[PDB]
């Protein structure tokens, strides 16, 4: 089977050459490995730090066991710096194993707003990166199943035109076999009373209102992790090889002309016992947004101000590691009446005004007047290097909010015995960074600082959205099932105002684990690290193809876009392979 095909001994790859080396066998890495090896003449070696976990059992295969895997060897649990908002560190859950974070994630399958993806082309100068093109690649990746009568009665709505049905990633309604809770439709009724839309298909380009959604699982409810979907059907390909249990430490560079060329990578688990493997065509970094930028820095690609003090020569100076954008998540949970029993998840993608309510006027005033100041402050905190360029991102977010009315926060509902909301501001203005703190890749000594709540609108927005979750939990039809709040519960007065929520939130939040931007895909002039074909500026044969590259956040869960991104970049890689024969 697959396990016997996987390589574990470095001696089996040391010194060899393949066409492409992919660092990281996660979502983007395995999608790309599969796409590239469709041509039998193209060889790929994936180097993954973890191992095969897809058939371990329910802890991985059952989406309802979500979170049980945290703290295990399948969770990297990257620790942040001591955060300024609360003087505590936080853990960034991140999958360690073939499939990456798709082994441990919530399985939510939704897409962002058309205007958000269109701006990657119109504002971030990435030719061809627009909604129509990216969505086509997303549907190509997708193998969706329409909901049945029971699922539709629970609240599902599926527009076939917005989904691929002959792709690779199996997606369909989560259905534990139990009755669906009426609380999903109660939330829909409660927001309908406020004039908010419901049941829009969140795969169509307008994620607004309250809807249910597909999940990444097969009909039999087994998790559709990226290894199960992209590696398990293809592992017998002789041109596709996978080394497990090893970390890529750095990219090996050779230079005989005006630009360095990536010729391979160094890998291992500890300093002093490393090996190299080589790429005839290209090295592709797919180790995740917390790691790919560090691999570049360990290689001499990053800011001299960061590298020089660590004893690393700066081969290519780029703002690697800046522009980190992750969201903050808080919880409101309530006990329910027995009539609310049953399974079901849904989410409210709430606009800026839906989020802020009566505070909308004040929040809009901040958005209209503080952008330059906020940009200067984020740059001074080291979250970005160029104020003028950061202001472009801020003006883009303001445009999304004011002129497109895109969803600003997400209130994610879980039922199954309670009414629980995990809530996050989708569009943070704060910008953080990740930088290595030592030259030894295998020490894994780094400073990962998302700078949560260091921008005032992010704190106000999170507080408003979380207060909204409490409000809606006891509004309209939701009152039918409400049986008392349990979180915050005693920890925050039930009648708390917005100011009280802003004081509470820094001590009751978790990272959302949607970090993007550390190797941003935008022009070098704007602070970018990679071009529109994911190529690292000024380096031959080196690309970053994972969550490090989106230059902005999006009003959605990211898998639909990341699968699309990997297929789109794979086409660019194949075009270069075809022309360079």
Ligand X SMILES: Cc1cc2nc3c(=O)[nH]c(=O)nc-3n(C[C@H](O)[C@H](O)[C@H](O)COP(=O)(O)OP(=O)(O)OC[C@H]3O[C@@H](n4cnc5c(N)ncnc54)[C@H](O)[C@@H]3O)c2cc1C
Ligand Y SMILES: *[C@@H]1O[C@H](CO)[C@@H](O[C@@H]2O[C@H](CO)[C@@H](O[C@@H]3O[C@H](CO)[C@@H](O)[C@H](O[C@H]4O[C@H](CO)[C@@H](O)[C@H](O)[C@@H]4O[C@H]4O[C@H](CO)[C@@H](O)[C@H](O)[C@@H]4O)[C@@H]3O)[C@H](O)[C@H]2NC(C)=O)[C@H](O)[C@H]1NC(C)=O
- Binding-site residue set: 27-28, 48, 101, 105-106, 108, 248, 535-536, 547, 559
Angle, helices 27-36 vs 559-579, to 10°: value is: 40
Q: Which of these ranges, 55-63, 268-276, 381-389, 442-450, lies near ligand NAG under the rule CB under 6 A?
A: 381-389
Cβ-based nearer residue to ligand Y, 83 or 379: 83
Report the distance separating Cα 344 and Cα 183, nearest Å.
8
354 touches ligand NAG by CB under 6 A = no
Query: Considering only CA atoms, which of 50, 110, 28, 8 is closest in space to residue 545?
Result: 28
Task: Please provide residue 169's backbone torsions phi and psi, each rounded to the nearest 5 degrees.
Answer: -85, 110
Query: Which of Cl ion, ligand Y, ligand X, none sits in contact with 105, Cβ below 5 to 8 A by type?
Result: ligand X
Q: Site residues for ligand Y, window 79-98 (CB under 6 A)? A: 86-87
In the chain, the largest separation of any two C-alpha atoms, in whole Å, equals 72
Identify which of residues 161 and 258 has a Cβ nearer to ligand NAG in the complex. 161
Q: Considering only residues 264-303, where is the footprint of ligand X by CB under 6 A? A: 286-289, 291
State the residue for tokens 């507080």. 463
Mask: binding to ligand X, 9-48, rule CB under 6 A, as x and -? --------------xxxxxxx-----------------xx
Which of these ranges, 36-44, 104-112, 384-392, 522-530, lies near ligand X under the rule CB under 6 A? 104-112
- Tell which positions 486-525 bind ligand X, by CB under 6 A: 513-514
> How far is residue 65 from each of residues 61, 106, 353, 429, measured CA to CA in Å?
8, 9, 35, 33
Q: Is 388 among the residues that bind ligand NAG (CB under 6 A)?
A: yes
579 touching ligand Y, by CB under 6 A? no
Helix, strand, coil percent values for the chain (each to nearest 5): 35, 25, 45
Residue 526 binds which of ligand NAG, ligand Y, Cl ion, none (CB < 5-8 A, kind-dependent): ligand NAG
Give the Cα separation of 25 and 230 in Å (integer): 10
Whose CA is closest to 346, among 123, 459, 182, 456? 182
Which of residues 526, 529, 542, 573 is near ligand NAG by CB under 6 A? 526
What is the nearest approach in angstroms of ligand NAG to the Cβ of residue 392?
6
Tell me if 41 contacts ligand Y by CB under 6 A: no
For ligand X, the closer of residues 248 and 379 by Cβ is 248
The smaller minimum CB distance to Cl ion, of residues 140 and 239, is found at 140
Residues whose CB is less than 8 angstroms from the CB of residue 364 and which lie 6 or more positions away in sequence, other chains included:
352, 402
User: What's the CA angle centered on 181, arms 178 and 182, to 5 degrees?
Assistant: 145
Shortest Cβ 321–ligand Y spacing (Å): 24
Nearer to ligand NAG, 279 or 464 (CB): 464
Verify whether residue 76 is a known catalytic residue: no
Tally Cβ neighbours within 10 Å of residue 275: 14
CA angle 71, 465, 565 (to 5 degrees): 60
Among 557, 564, 570, 573, binds ligand X (CB under 6 A): 557
C-alpha to C-alpha distances, 150 to 37, 184, 199, 211, nearest whole angstrom: 40, 13, 15, 16
Kindly state the smallest distance separating residue 54's Cβ from Cl ion, in Å.
15
**Rg of the chain in Å (alpha carbons):** 23
- Return the residue matching tokens 């203005």: 429
In our burial notation (b when 16+ CB lie closer than 10 A, e otherwise), range 391-429 reads bbbbebbbebbeeebbbbbbbbbbbbebbbbbbbbbbbb
Stretch near ligand X under the rule CB under 6 A, chosen from 6-14, 101-109, 364-372, 473-481? 101-109
If one asks whether residue 214 binds ligand X (CB under 6 A), the answer comes out as no
508 binds ligand Y (CB under 6 A): no
DSSP state letter for 26: S
Region binding ligand X by CB under 6 A among candidate stretches 96-104, 149-157, 174-182, 519-527: 96-104
The encoded tokens of residue 200 equal 């829009």
**116 contributes a contact to ligand X by CB under 6 A:** no
Contact residue for ligand NAG among 360, 480, 486, 540 (CB under 6 A): 360
* CA-based nearest residue to 547, from 537, 560, 539, 538: 560
- Closest distance between ligand X and the C-beta of residue 169, in Å? 11
Restricting to residues 401-460, name those near ligand X by CB under 6 A. none
Q: Which is nearer to ligand Y, 346 or 505 (CB)?
A: 505
Identify the three-state secondary structure at position 252: strand
136: contact with ligand NAG by CB under 6 A = no
How many residues make up the chain in this entry?
Answer: 581
Of all residues in this chain, which one has the CB nearest to ligand X in the complex? 26
| Shortest spacing between CB 87 and ligand Y, in angstroms | 4
The set of residues, in sequence order, having a beta carbon less than 8 Å from that of 103 and lying 6+ positions away, is 53, 54, 60, 69, 74, 95, 97, 223, 225, 227
CB 542 within 8 A of CB 490: no
Tell me the two tokens of residue 72: 């295990």
Select from 18, 42, 106, 400 the one that contacts ligand X (CB under 6 A).
Answer: 106
The answer to whether residue 381 forms part of the interface with ligand Y (CB under 6 A) is no
Interacting positions 291-320 with ligand NAG (CB under 6 A): none
* Rounded CA separation 255/367 (Å): 47
Residue 308 interacts, among ligand X, ligand Y, Cl ion, none and using kind-specific CB cut-offs from 5 to 8 Å, with none
Query: Does 361 sit near ligand NAG (CB under 6 A)?
Result: yes
Structure tokens at 534: 């994911």
Stretch that binds ligand NAG, among 84-92, 242-250, 358-366, 571-579 (CB under 6 A): 358-366
Q: What is the DSSP letter of 52?
A: -
Binding residues for O2: 535-536
Q: Interface with Cl ion includes 219 (CB under 5 A)?
A: yes
Contact between 355 and 471 under an 8 Å Cβ cutoff? The reply is no
Residues in 156-215 that interact with Cl ion by CB under 5 A: 170
- b vs e for 477-486, b when ≥16 Cβ sit within 10 Å of the residue's Cβ? bbeebbeebe
Pair 496, 464: CB distance under 8 Å: no
Q: Which of 76, 281, 435, 514 is catalytic?
A: 514
Residues that bind ligand X (CB under 6 A): 23-29, 47-50, 93-97, 100-102, 104-108, 247-248, 286-289, 291, 513-514, 546-547, 557-559, 562
The footprint of Cl ion (CB under 5 A) covers 170, 218-219
Interface residues toward ligand Y, by CB under 6 A: 86-87
- Can you give the binding site for ligand NAG, defined by CB under 6 A? 159, 161, 201, 204, 353, 360-361, 364, 386, 388-389, 392, 405, 525-526
Q: Which residues are catalytic?
A: 514
């Amino acid at each position: 089977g697959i396990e016997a095909s996987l390589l574990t001994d470095p001696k089996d790859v040391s010194g060899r050459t393949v066409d492409y080396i992919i660092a990281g066998g996660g979502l983007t890495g395995l999608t790309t490995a599969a796409r590239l090896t469709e041509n039998p003449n193209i060889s790929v070696l994936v180097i993954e730090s973890g191992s095969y976990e897809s058939d371990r059992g329910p802890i991985i295969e059952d989406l309802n066991a979500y979170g049980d895997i945290f703290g295990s060897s399948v969770d990297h649990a990257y620790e942040t710096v001591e955060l300024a908002t609360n003087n505590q560190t936080a853990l960034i859950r991140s999958g360690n194993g073939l499939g990456g974070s798709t082994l441990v994630n919530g399985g939510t399958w939704t897409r962002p707003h058309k205007a958000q993806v269109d701006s990657w082309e119109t504002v971030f100068g990435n030719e061809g990166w627009n909604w129509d093109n990216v969505a086509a690649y997303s549907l190509q990746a997708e193998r969706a199943r329409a909901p049945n009568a029971k699922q539709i009665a629970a609240g599902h709505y599926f527009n076939a035109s917005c989904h691929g049905v002959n792709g690779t990633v199996h997606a369909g309604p989560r259905d534990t076999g139990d009755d669906y809770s009426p609380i999903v439709k109660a939330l829909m009724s409660a927001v309908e009373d406020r004039g908010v839309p419901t049941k829009k298909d969140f795969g169509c380009g307008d994620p607004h209102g309250v809807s249910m959604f597909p999940n990444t699982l097969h009909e039999d409810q087994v998790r559709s992790d990226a290894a199960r979907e992209w590696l398990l059907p293809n592992y017998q390909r002789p041109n596709l090889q996978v080394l497990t249990g090893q970390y890529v430490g750095k990219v090996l560079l050779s230079q005989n002309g005006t630009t360095p060329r990536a010729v391979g990578v160094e890998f291992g688990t500890h300093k002093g016992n490393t090996h190299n493997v080589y790429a005839k065509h290209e090295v592709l970094l797919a180790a995740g947004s917390a790691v790919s930028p560090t691999i570049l820095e360990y290689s001499g690609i990053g800011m001299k101000s960061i590298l020089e003090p660590l004893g690393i020569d700066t081969v290519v100076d780029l703002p690697v590691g800046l522009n980190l954008q992750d969201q903050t998540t808080a919880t409101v949970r309530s006990r329910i009446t027995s009539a609310g029993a049953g399974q079901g998840q849904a989410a409210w993608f709430a606009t800026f005004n839906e989020t802020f309510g009566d505070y909308s006027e004040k929040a809009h005033e901040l958005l209209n007047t503080k952008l330059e100041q906020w940009a200067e402050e984020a740059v001074a905190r080291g979250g970005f290097h160029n104020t003028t360029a950061l202001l472009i991102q801020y003006e883009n977010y303001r445009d999304w909010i004011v002129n497109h009315n895109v969803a600003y926060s997400e209130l994610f509902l879980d039922t199954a015995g309670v009414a629980s909301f995990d809530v996050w501001d989708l569009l943070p203005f704060t910008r953080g960074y990740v930088h290595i703190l030592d030259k030894d890749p295998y020490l894994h000594h780094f400073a990962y600082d998302p700078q949560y709540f260091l921008n005032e609108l992010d704190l106000l927005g999170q507080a408003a959205a979380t207060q909204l979750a409490r409000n809606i939990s006891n509004s309209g039809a939701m009152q039918t099932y409400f049986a008392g709040e349990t979180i915050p519960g005693d920890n925050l007065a039930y009648d708390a105002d917005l100011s009280a929520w802003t004081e509470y939130i820094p001590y009751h939040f978790r990272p959302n684990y949607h970090g993007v931007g550390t190797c941003s895909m935008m022009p070098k002039e704007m602070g970018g690290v990679v071009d529109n074909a994911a190529r690292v500026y000024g380096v031959q044969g080196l690309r970053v193809i994972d969550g490090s590259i989106p230059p902005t956040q999006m009003s959605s869960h990211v898998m639909t876009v990341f699968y699309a991104m990997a297929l789109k970049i794979s086409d660019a890689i194949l075009e270069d392979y075809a022309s360079m024969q």
